[PDB]
Amino acid sequence: RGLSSRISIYWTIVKPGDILVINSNGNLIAPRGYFKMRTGKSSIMRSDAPIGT
Amino acid sequence: GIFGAIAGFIENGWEGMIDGWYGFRHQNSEGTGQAADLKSTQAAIDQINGKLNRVIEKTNEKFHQIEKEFSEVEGRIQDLEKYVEDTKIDLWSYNAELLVALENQHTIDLTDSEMNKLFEKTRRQLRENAEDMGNGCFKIYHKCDNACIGSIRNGTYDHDVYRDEALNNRF
Ligand SMILES: *[C@@H]1O[C@H](CO)[C@@H](O)[C@H](O)[C@H]1NC(C)=O
């Protein structure tokens, strides 16, 4: 898509009471915030099957 | 089966009996008749259902699991994920095959059992007034009209009544 360059994606989970610290002298692609984490019955599947009512 | 009644000393089944699993056919002075035995039919059906309900019961709910297909060759970890799933499937496949074999063998044996039990119950009722013809038929040595046959079927037959007559005709 035009580029010979790349971005590498990483993740960090921070539990309550912990602290995030980000330190960069450059090349950093910074987070804009956080995604809420939940536990439950959710999951993911690969399928081409049409969804139907 | 294991009691030798069904496909046993009882030659074959009656396609003509549509109202029960087990019953009586009789021939006496008045004519021929056929009637289903509902108690033993029920015994069989109940057991078979009990079992059917054991097996058909609620399945297990699972949500997020390991991935079972792969688009890239990764080596070790994929080898392991693949091996685990394959192991699981082989074991459950075994459980199912065996469940069916055992259960079926037992169903065959228990239905045979019910038949034989009805036969035995009846023979015991009749006491000295009849003989086992070996084909699953009794020979009744006194005069038995439709009421009397009925009394045999609903378990109220009083042998002492006909004992003299029958004893006489047997010997
Ligand atoms: C059995 O049959 C006899 C004669 O048909 C009848 O009088 C009697 O009530 C029956 N017994 C039962 C418990 O159904």
Q: Which residues contact B169 (CB under 8 A, 6 or more apart)?
A: B141, B142
**Cβ atoms of B153 and B29 closer than 8 Å:** no
Which chain B residues contact residue A44 at CB under 8 A?
Answer: 64
User: How far apart are the C-alpha atoms of B149 and B140, rounded to whole Å?
Assistant: 10
Classify strands B23-28 and B130-132 as parallel, antiparallel or unpaired: unpaired
Which chain B residue lies closest to A44 (C-alpha atoms)? B64
DSSP-based three-state secondary structure for B122: helix
CA dist., res. B32 & res. B57, Å (int): 45
CA angle B90, B94, B98 (to 5 degrees): 175
Other Cβ atoms within 10 Å of B138 Cβ, number: 19
User: CA-CA distance, B98 to B83, in Å (whole number)?
Assistant: 23
Q: Which chain B residue is nearest to residue A46, measuring alpha carbons?
A: B69
Experimental technique, in short, is: X-ray
Distance CA A7, CA A2 (A): 14
The tokens of B90 are what? 């082989």
- Give CA angle at B36 (B162, B139), nearest 5°: 35
Q: What is the pairing mode between strands B130-132 and B138-140? A: antiparallel
Chain B interface disruption, residue of A39, A41, A47, A48, most B CBs within 10 A: A41
- Which are the contacts of B170, defined by CB distance < 8 A and separation ≥ 6? B128, B131, B141
Output the DSSP codes for B35-94: EE-HHHHHHHHHHHHHHHHHHSS------S------SS---HHHHHHHHHHHHHHHHHHH
Domain-by-domain residue ranges, chain B?
A: 1-171
CA B18 centroid distance within chain: 16
Residue A29 CA to residue A10 CA, distance in Å, equals 10
Cα(B66)–Cα(A53) distance, integer angstroms: 28
Please give the Cα distance from B22 to B41 (Å, whole number). Answer: 6
DSSP annotation string for A1-53? ---S-----------TT-------SS------S-PPP--SS-------PPP--
- Interface with chain A: mutation pick from B60, B62, B64, highest number of A CBs within 10 Å: B64
Residue in the block written with tokens 């995030």 = A20
- Cα(A37)–Cα(A11) distance, rounded to whole angstroms? 13
Touching check for A38 and chain B: CB below 8 Å?
Answer: no
Residues 6+ apart with CB under 8 A from B63: A41, A42, A43
What CATH architecture does domain B1-171 belong to? Alpha-Beta Complex (3.90)
Answer whether B108's CB lies under 8 Å from B92's CB. Answer: no
Tokens of residue A3, six digits: 């580029």
What resolution in angstroms, rounded to 1 decimal? 3.0
